[PDB]
Each structure stands twice: as C-alpha cells, then as structure tokens.
Symmetry: D2
Subunit: 265 residues, 4 copies
C-alpha cells in the first residue's frame, strides 16, 4: 500500500463521521500500522474505532493536559514496542466554545473561551510535535487539519482566527521538525459534515443558514465540485502527505477543497 509498514499516530476520532476516522481507515487500507489517541469519551471512541479495518491501540490524550503530553511519547513506544519509532503523526483536533462562533456576536466571545479554542486548535499542534518528534523516524511526516482562514466569513468567527494561528504555528513546527528530517504540513479541507456539522442544524438559526450558503457556494466554485458528505478525498490527501510522495514539501498547506479557493465566482 501507499503507507506500507509505516507507523502512524492519529488523533481526533470522536465519531465515524470524524475526518480522523476516515484518515485512519484509508491509512490502514494502505498498509499503515496505527496508534490512535482519544479525548474524554474513550468508551465511545474505543467502540467507534472497532469498526476500522484493523485493530489499533487507543491512547488517552487531552492536549490541554500537560501530564498527558509529557507521558505521551512513552505510552506510544510501549504500544509500538521499544526499538520502533513513528513515521507519521496526524493532528485532527479542533474546538471553539459556542460563544466564539455562530450567531453569537464576534465581539461577545470571552477571551477565556477564545483562549481555550486557540490552545486546542492551534497551540497543541506544536505541543504534539514537541512530544512526538523525539520518537519519529527521518523521512517522517506531521499533518494537521486546517480550514482556509485567509479571508473572513460569517459564523466561523474565532475558529477562523485559531486556524490563522495554526498556519503560523505549522511554519514554525516545520523549522523544528526539519532537524529530525521530518516534514510538517496542513491539509486545508472544504466543509465536511462531521459532528459539529451541528452548526448547519445549534449555533443559532442564521448561522446555520450561512453555513448552508458556504457549503452551496463551495460546490459551485469548485471546478471539480465538492461533496461534503464524502470525507474520502480529504483522507487520501492526508495519506499523500504521510507517504514518501511529497518529500520536498514542508511548512506548507495542501488544499483538498475541490479547488474552490482558487476561484472567485
């Protein structure tokens, strides 16, 4: 397969609608040996990951928990046995409290909420690279999930700001990862109907309409179209970055959005 005999960590699975779930599935189809991490509802997460092609160890990881991060590399090594290292890391984690999104005014989000969001959605990319780089092989690859924040838009609000921060964090992580012979990139995906997708049904009628408007305009703008209910094209893109087939790309963003961002109307 594309990732034959590669040992790859995947964070971010919460349902079988999670982008990370599909990244995991495709990685396994492509021959990769996985270690998974989960936040909070690990009973649920375990049951969910049972439906993946192959069995995988599931580790606890709250990115805001300094102890989890500090014990993380050791718990992975045990999971994959001493002598072996990781070839890939997938950051598919995000969060922004309700006050920082939706119909709730941009100006009314408490800094505490915004800060919790940036910690989870942006700072933790660096946290995970820090914990995991010492157990990564050269030629390795760290990949995180992004949503093009280069332009403002309704509803997304402070999550946009967090992704803007994330992209900046990525460029710096690339500097550190390169010392290890490891690449660091982001996959900017178009809208995918995940857990929080959610806002289309929550963030306040109005925000929901705007989300639907965003979705609709995305499919039209994309020269090859965009669905939306299919996370597979995004998972394949992530896998492409984990493979040895983009070996000169780092600190960068690969857009798996149907080309929508390259078109105005």
């Amino acid at each position: 397969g594309l990732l034959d005999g590669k040992r790859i960590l995947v964070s971010g699975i919460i349902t079988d609608s999670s982008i990370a779930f599909h990244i995991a599935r495709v990685a396994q189809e492509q021959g990769a040996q996985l270690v998974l991490t989960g936040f909070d509802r690990l009973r649920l997460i375990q049951r969910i990951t049972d439906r993946l092609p192959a069995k995988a160890p599931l580790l606890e990881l709250d990115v805001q928990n300094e102890e989890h991060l500090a014990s993380l590399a050791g718990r992975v090594t045990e999971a994959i046995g001493a002598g072996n290292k990781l070839d890939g890391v997938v950051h598919s984690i995000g969060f922004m409290p309700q006050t920082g999104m939706g119909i709730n005014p941009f100006f009314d989000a408490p800094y505490a909420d915004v800060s919790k969001g940036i910690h989870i959605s942006a700072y933790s990319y660096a946290s995970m690279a820090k914990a995991l780089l010492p157990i990564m092989n050269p030629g390795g690859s760290i990949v995180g999930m992004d949503f093009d924040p280069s332009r403002a838009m309704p509803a997304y609000n402070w999550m946009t700001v967090a992704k803007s921060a994330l992209e900046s964090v990525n460029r710096f992580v690339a500097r550190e990862a390169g010392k290890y012979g490891v690449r660091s990139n982001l996959v900017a995906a178009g809208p995918i109907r995940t857990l929080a997708m959610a806002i289309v049904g929550a963030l306040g009628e109005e925000a929901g309409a705007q989300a639907q408007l965003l979705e609709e305009g995305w499919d039209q703008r994309a020269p090859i179209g965009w669905n939306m209910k299919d996370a597979t094209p995004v998972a394949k893109t992530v896998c492409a970055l984990l493979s040895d087939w983009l070996p000169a790309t780092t600190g960068d963003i690969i857009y798996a959005d149907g080309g929508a961002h390259t078109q105005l109307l």
Copy 2:
C-alpha cells in the same frame, strides 16, 4: 489644510519616545488631529513621555486585559473630547509576548499561559478596543493596527509571529463589524524599527534581518526612523483611502515584494 485637520483620534501604545505610537501621535498632531491617548501601566511615567508630544493630550488608563477598563473606555473618552463629539480614528499600537515566547527561548519551550497572554494583548485586544470604541466613532472613521508580516516563519519572532497571524485574521473580522458603522479597519505592516543584550547569536540574527531588509527594499529601509511608518498610519486615518478595509498596507520599503 492639515491631513487630519479637525479629526479626533485615540492612540494607544506610547511607552517611550521611541515607541512607534509616539511618532504616530507626533505626526497626527503635526497634521492637525486632536488626540486622546491611552496608557497601560505606570501612568505617571508615560505622562512625562506624552508631555514631549507636539501638543498636550488627555491620558486615559487602559489595560487591555481588564474588561472593566474596556467597558468604561468609551465614556471616559467622550468626557475627554467633550460629550457631543466622537472619534474619527483609533490607533492600536500594542504588542506583548513574554521572553519565553520570543527571542532566544526554543519555540517548543513556551508555556501556553505566556503565549495566551501574548495573544490576548497582541491580537484579541484589537477586537476589544473596536468593541469598546465603535459606538462612539463617526462614519468614515478609521481603525489602524500595527503588524509585522507573519506570512513566513523567521528566527526569534516565534510566538509573536503567531500572534500577528492571529491579529490579521482578527482585523478581517473587525472590518465586518466596523462596516456597520461606516468605519474602516486596517493594519500597517511595518519593517523593523529600532525601538547584544540577548547574546551573540541573537545580535547577529537582528543585524542580518536589518541588513537584509534594507538590501531587499527597492527604496531601502531606515530602521532608525519611524517617520515613514507614522505617515502611513496617518494616510489610513485620513480620507484618502476610503475604499480600503480588512486590509494590510505594507510600510516596509517594499521588502516583502522581493526575494533577494
């Protein structure tokens, strides 16, 4: 006629007479603006600095992390310019990142608590001030913030670069809200301004950036002079960029447009 004749503009961020905000206020005054100034910590000390400005101006206390200062800010400004009057301009020239997040400390070594404080003061506060001051701004008004181009990574700037990226995104959103008021929102991205203390390596890094910046800039770059940056901000506060908002104007000698 002065460029900002009759305009009423609030400037934050003056701490020394070397501060970018100090020269912005100076030029704005030379061009006829009526200023309200804000100050963070030692309010007595900056009063001494602000006394060296071309003309006297009200000095209001504003710690941007204190949500109480923010809630009362508009009232205290209206009291200063006299009730019945509003602001035509707001200048955000505030930035902070602890040494743990910039300079010599390894990028992975910055604790989030410090990063978070840095982001609050350097980016979120742009939204905070806008929230506080938009209800008392005139249509056609202008909010200007200070930026340092964070589109690419670089030595030392580290987490402040991440803050500046955050800020740019914040600026695009503030534009959406300021638009309801007829108000523009923009950032001025400035070249390096002189506002071995960090060691031999850091001193060489800084020298290399400065040399490289003047080298890269088609019209050169004078790190000793904040006057061109001040003037750019005054351009944005004026009425001569009326169709520009959510945007970034680069006052960097054009360095960012050139590879070598």
Copy 3:
C-alpha cells in the same frame, strides 16, 4: 493646501469622462497637481473630454505599442513642463484585451496574437512607460497602475485576468528599477467600475448569460465588501491613487493597494 500641491504628474488612459483616469486626473487637479495628459488614438475627441477637467493640461500622444512614441515621450513631456522641471508622478490607467480573450469567447478559443496584444498594452507597457519616464522623475516620486485582483479565476475576465497577473509581477520588477531613482511603483486593485462597456454588458449587449454573471459579480462584490461597493462611483478609487501619488505612503513599493470596499478580504 491640497494633497498634491506643487507636483507634476503624467496621466494616461482618459478616453471618456467616465474613465477612471479621468476621475484620477480631476481629483489630482483638485489637490493642486500640475497635470500632463497622454492620448492614444482619438486625439481630438479626448481633448474635448480633457477640457471638461477643472484645469486645462497639455495633451500628448502616446501609443504604448509605438516604440518611437515611447522614445520621444520624455522630451515631449519636458517640452510641456519646461526644462529644469521634472515629474513627481505617473499614472498608468491603460488596459486592453480583445473580445476573443475576454467575455463570452471560450478561454480556449483566444488566439495568442490577440492575447499577446492584450498583454503588451495591459502589462508590458507598465515597464515601457516606466522606462521612458523614470529618467525625468524626481526622487520621492510615484508611479501607479490600475489593477483588477487576478489572484483567483472568474467568469468572463479570462485572459484579461492573465494580463493583470502579469502586470502585478511586472510592477514588482519596475519597483526595483524605480528604486534607483527614489521612486516608488504601486498598483491600485480597484473594485468593478461601471465603464460604458461595463454598463453595456449589464444591459445585455453580451447576451443573457453574460449579463447575468455581471449582475452576480457586482451584487456579490457589494455584499462581500464590509463597507459596501458602489460600481457607479470611481471617486474612492481616484483618491486612493492620489494617496499613492502623495508623500503619505513613502515606504510602500512593488505593492498593491486594494480600493475595493474590502471585498477581497471576505469569503462571503
């Protein structure tokens, strides 16, 4: 004392009194600039237009594809402002792309002869203009060209988009050359302005479909723009050019200023 008091500025691209160049010229004259104008083909018709400016100005002939017109322009400008006087500003508001590379014609069906002519006039000429006039410009001076944001593709604009992309790259290189003279070079990326050709297509002169895309482009532009966009008002763009011609943006060059309502900064 106006923004541009005591400055000598060359303006190109006046063809009608609706031309962006016409509004730029008007506002510049209003701000105390001493203008020199250039004209391409209909030299006596444009004089009639240029006489509608608040101040009369020497109209010189310039076909940017005419290599001898370029070779003589500096001298003919000197003749109009008197020796010992130099130019402080230059406005390039010149654009052209044949209907084969723009509008309804399929992107693939534009012949290169047509595209090349478009790129010559719309992009290359920025550099040939700079080349001609730099040796008679004062330091601290300014050259500005008109742009339409080509970073993303869109219906109808087709090869004119390509030319503007080329123009943005040219401007970055012109900046390097002009820097040797203490001169800045910048573009103003304007939002869509109702030229007579723009009003015509909206009316339906390019057919029902083209007319629909036009409404859509304009309606969406004003929507996206946080401060809105009025396609019938070229004044905010003209002031932006004057800002750049002034000394108030002294450290900006090789760059693009967006006078577009902020639309380009907003996804929806």
Copy 4:
C-alpha cells in the same frame, strides 16, 4: 502495485537526461505508467535521451508555438496509444525566455517580441496543450505544469518571472475547463534544479539542487489518485523554502 499503475500519461519537456521531465518520466515508468513523450527541436537527439528511460515510449513532435502540431496532436497520441484509449495524465514541463529577458540583461531593455515569445511558450502553451488533450482525457485525469514561485521579484529571473506569474493565472482558468471533463489541473513550484545557495539554508528540510527526484515524485503524486480534491492549485516542492523568510 505502482502508484500510477496502468495510467496513460503524456510527458513533454525532455531535452537531456537532466531535464525535470526526464526524471518525471523515469519515476512515472517505475510506478507503472505507460508514457507518451513529446519533443521540440532536435527530435533525433532527444530520442537518444529517451532511450535511457526504463521502458520504451512512442516519441511525438510538438512545438507549442505550432498550430499544426497542436491541431494534430490528440490524433497522433490516440494513434500511439490505440483507438479506444484515452490519457489519464499530462505533464507540461516547458519553458523559454530569450537571453535579453533574463540574467544580467536589463529588465527595461528586453523587446516585447522577446517577452511575447517567452510568455507564449512558457504560459499560453499550458492552455493550448490543455485545449488539445482534454478531449482525449479520462475522467479523474490530471494535468501538471512546472512552476517557479514568482510571487516576489528576484535578480536574474526577470521576464521569466513575469511568464510564471502569467502561468499561475492560466492554470486557474484551465482548471475551470478541465473540471468539465472531471480532470484536475495543478502546478508544481519547484526549487532550483541544475539544468540560490540560500535555498538550502531557508528550506527546513534542506534542498539539494542536483537532485530532481523529489520534484519528480511530487509531480507523480499529482498525477496519482492521491490528490483527488486539488485543482487550480500550486504544490510547492522546494524544501519548504518559500514558507520561511530567513
């Protein structure tokens, strides 16, 4: 199984064994693609070069400035791949600028006729090759062109930089047309390959300007089905140098 297993791919731009297109071709064949090659001037000479390719591939003639080559191309391709067969990928690895538009020669001194020829071969030809070949491409196919990041001005590269800026715009528009066929259009912006020393410096993973394989691999990635939602775009294979200021 190969990455491009069973795929029919046209590859232009091979002139010597050091061409990006040579290694693109080389890596593609290693990944199980059946190739068609195209060459420009010295057809006999470049034929001797394609001999070294791991397999044999039918070599056709294509001057992108020649309307006749372009008009007959798809037919000459179908003839080589057999009726009933289409292409799955196309590689555009073509560039040219007359000396006066590059190097030491002043930016202002280059005649438009030189620039126009550069722009024709370097930028317009991407749409022209797409026009020709899309009617013979399978859905899910991929078109790839070679780019050098022109977003900032730089010494020496000069008018070639203007050509690349134009190419990036053309690519966005080709993607509109290609999408109608279910086909993607992307650019690979590669670092300097021998055909700045500060490039290896800025690159967080370094950069070896004698090694075209990583660039070649990136192109193969875009030709694969592993970047199925990317079009109108630019993929940087430059050691990440463009993401760092210093």
